[PDB]
């Protein structure tokens, strides 16, 4: 009821992609905004974060100040990345949700046994990640990640701006062009907070019991 009619969603996906075609993360950034501003949290497009770095979030704030944030708190994370999220808050400009599934912890380990993600990573993820993930994705017409195409060799074909029929809307991946050297100087060059499980020899950070340890 408050989201825009799935054909004309796909246009506007469509569009997005043919008209950005090799700009830079701040202009789709840009258009973005000026796509889905109107009718500071009465935005009509978020932004999603998995707390390793504020570079996706200080470009949002940079272009859109009071921008909203979704983080996925599956109860997993390590406290490094709690602290990172509160951090991010408290710094930028940005008006962060602290999406949390239904059922808590201990809930689903009593429901369905303790340490489903040993299990079956898989349901975990699709309970605690991408179920919550869809539920709040109602709503918004466009949602931006900081997906890359250097992430996978899956992904080297990441578009720009596309419509992801998973959640059915548009989907914006401002940072797919960049690569590591590039993020690396962006950090340096704003002063961009990082997670400090970075830093302690981690590529990526997920939850605890499901990230590659050292
Ligand atoms: N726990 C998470 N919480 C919030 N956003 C996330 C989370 N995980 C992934 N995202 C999105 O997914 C991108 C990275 O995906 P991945 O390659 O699976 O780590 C991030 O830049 C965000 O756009
Ligand atoms: S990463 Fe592991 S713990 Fe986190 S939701 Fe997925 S399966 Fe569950």
Redesign the pocket.
Known sequence: TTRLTEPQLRELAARGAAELDGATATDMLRWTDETFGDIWTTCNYVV?????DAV?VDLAAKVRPGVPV???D?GYHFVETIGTRDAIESVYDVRVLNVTPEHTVAEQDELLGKDLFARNPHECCRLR?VVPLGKTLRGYSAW????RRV??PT?ANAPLVSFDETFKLVKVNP?AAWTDQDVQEYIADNDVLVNPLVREGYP?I?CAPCTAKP
């Open positions: 999603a974060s998995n707390m390793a996706l979704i983080f996925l599956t990640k931006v990640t900081g997906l992430d996978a992904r940072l990526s997920g």
